[PDB]
């Protein structure tokens, strides 16, 4: 997170912390809870092993609100696209169903076709990185401004605002970065978005899946 | 046991992961077997192939090392120094495709 | 070094080896009891307080009481372009001054300008990798190998082992190439793999910088 501050530890119950075993390495991640036994995120976090932690604050310290449970599926949506970055979804269907209390528990989702107007100001968390030289241990969080899809259309050649929508205002040195891909973007607890891609730079607008527009696949998939 | 961090710019777009490459037991490595490691991630990462990277505008990464340094490595290129680097002096790796 | 075969032990007194962290990572030349010369690539993005240059080795897993190690003091450098790998030399001012006996000499440098026409017979060695699976070598490797001007540019020396697949691997960086006895060469980069067998080896061509190491040595 650029620009933002820490969060009250476990003031974001829903908040994922994923951790992936790839061929050539390993990755971080965000998601968040949308069942008791489902976390929501990016298609791009996919990898053949997946750690979720869940109720952590200190991501870098064994807490005892701490959840850890292996994703014993991870379901990208069946038309992602690695090279446009195009319906970055996934599930995880977590191997055992959380135990749910005040540090744990899921986030609401949103009607179909819910607009978001442009103006907006939701919230973004996360524990990726705060510059191109620094990081964090515990979660942050911002404030970002919803953008018109010019702002987006004008930089992103694949943007496409009825799967995705645009983020930030370029004059706000505010936005996710890298480690938060696959966080919720929440406005009116509800989460719209799912952090997904922006430029190398950090410097935004920055582009998130529209959780709307996959609700009918998020639902059948869940069932 | 051994980590570097890098990422993937692909015509001005970059997902908001945070990704490193293993190098496991093995500290020693040199750009042959980088370039490759480089190339395996653009395919596994963004669906970049070796055709794709030949017909590129511009195809190219560079090593950031926390010295403060860096070296600029072109994809296609196949003239490798015959040096041997090691993994713990590397800070980062940045990927430009085009 | 690939399809070499084991120097005799201290056979090349003036062969160096430049060890970080512990491990080797790319040769060089004793050329003066107090220098040494290696290719530029080795040291430019390296911290040169923590390399140890150690002369007089043969097997780098042994301890032999045969070898002298020195820091480095100070690097020289001519004029190199990491962009298109020329003028790839460096010479490093020890922090002291080696003892010369029969495990320790200093190398014979060629005239300034000499250059070397194809098919000069000469002798590649190093301590870098012995294959693409097979490691990195704990002993000395030689091999002999000819001068080629097809496919080199003008700015290197490069050679060949034609009838197999030979050449210098990584770790070999910096090693001399000796021909006719003096110093023609110092590894600097592959093409395609390591013994492609269609593409030479390049060296920086030492006798075109020998009034510039000269100055330097003085
Ligand atoms: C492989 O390379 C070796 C070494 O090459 C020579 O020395 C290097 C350090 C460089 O300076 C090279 O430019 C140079 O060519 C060759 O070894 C040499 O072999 C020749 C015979 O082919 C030897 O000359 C003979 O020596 C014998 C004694 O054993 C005499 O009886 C002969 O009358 C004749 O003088 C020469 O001494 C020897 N040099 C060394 C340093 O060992 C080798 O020939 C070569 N092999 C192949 C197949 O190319
Ligand atoms: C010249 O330097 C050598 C090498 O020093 C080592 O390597 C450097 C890269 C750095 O890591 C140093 O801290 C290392 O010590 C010196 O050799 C060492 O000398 C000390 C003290 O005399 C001795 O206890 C060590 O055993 C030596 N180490 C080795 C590997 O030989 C050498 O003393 C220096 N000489 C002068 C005149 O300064
Ligand atoms: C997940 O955790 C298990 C047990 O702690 C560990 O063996 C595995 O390496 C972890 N995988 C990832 C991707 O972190």
Known sequence: ???????????????????????????????????????????????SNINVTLGAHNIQRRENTQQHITARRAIRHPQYNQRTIQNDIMLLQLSRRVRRNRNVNPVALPRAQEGLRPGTLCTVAGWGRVSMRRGTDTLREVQL????????????????????????????????????????????????????????????????????????????TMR | TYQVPYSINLNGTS???????????????????????????????????????????????????KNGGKRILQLNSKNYTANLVHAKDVKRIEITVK | IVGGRRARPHAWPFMVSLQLRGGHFCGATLIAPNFVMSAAHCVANVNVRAVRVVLGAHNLSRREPTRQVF????????????????????????????????????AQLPAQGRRLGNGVQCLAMGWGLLGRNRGIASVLQ??????????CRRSNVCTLV?????????????????????????????????????????????????????????
């Open chain 1, 1 to 47: 997170i650029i620009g933002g501050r820490e969060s009250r530890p476990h003031s974001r119950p829903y908040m994922a912390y994923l951790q992936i075993q790839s061929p050539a390495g390993q990755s971080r991640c965000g998601g968040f809870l949308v069942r008791e036994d489902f976390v929501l995120t990016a298609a791009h976090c996919w990898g």
């Open chain 1, 145 to 220: 401004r919803v953008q018109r899809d010019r702002q987006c259309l004008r930089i992103f050649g694949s943007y496409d605002p009825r799967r995705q929508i645009c983020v930030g205002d370029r004059r706000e040195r505010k936005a996710a970065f890298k480690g938060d891909s696959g966080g919720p973007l929440l406005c009116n607890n509800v989460a719209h978005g799912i952090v997904s891609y922006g430029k190398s730079s950090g410097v935004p607008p920055e582009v998130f899946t529209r959780v709307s527009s996959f609700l009918p696949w998020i639902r059948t």
């Open chain 2, 15 to 65: 997902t908001n992961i945070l990704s490193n490459l293993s190098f496991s037991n093995k500290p020693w490595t040199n750009y042959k077997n980088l370039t490759s490691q480089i190339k395996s991630v653009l395919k596994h990462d963004r669906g970049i192939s070796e055709q794709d990277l030949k017909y590129a505008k511009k195809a190219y990464y560079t090593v950031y090392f």
């Open chain 3, 71 to 106: 820091a480095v003091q100070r690097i020289f450098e001519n004029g190199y372009d990491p962009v298109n790998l020329l003028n790839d030399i460096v010479i490093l001012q020890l922090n002291g001054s080696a003892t010369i006996n029969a495990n320790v000499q200093v």
């Open chain 3, 142 to 151: 030689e091999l002999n190998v000819t001068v080629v001007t097809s496919l």
């Open chain 3, 162 to 218: 034609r009838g197999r697949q030979a050449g210098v691997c990584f770790g070999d960086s910096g090693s001399p190439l000796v021909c006719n006895g003096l110093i023609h060469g110092i590894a600097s980069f592959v093409r395609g793999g390591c013994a492609s067998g269609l593409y030479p080896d390049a060296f920086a061509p030492v006798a075109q910088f020998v009034n510039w190491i000269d100055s330097i040595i003085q």
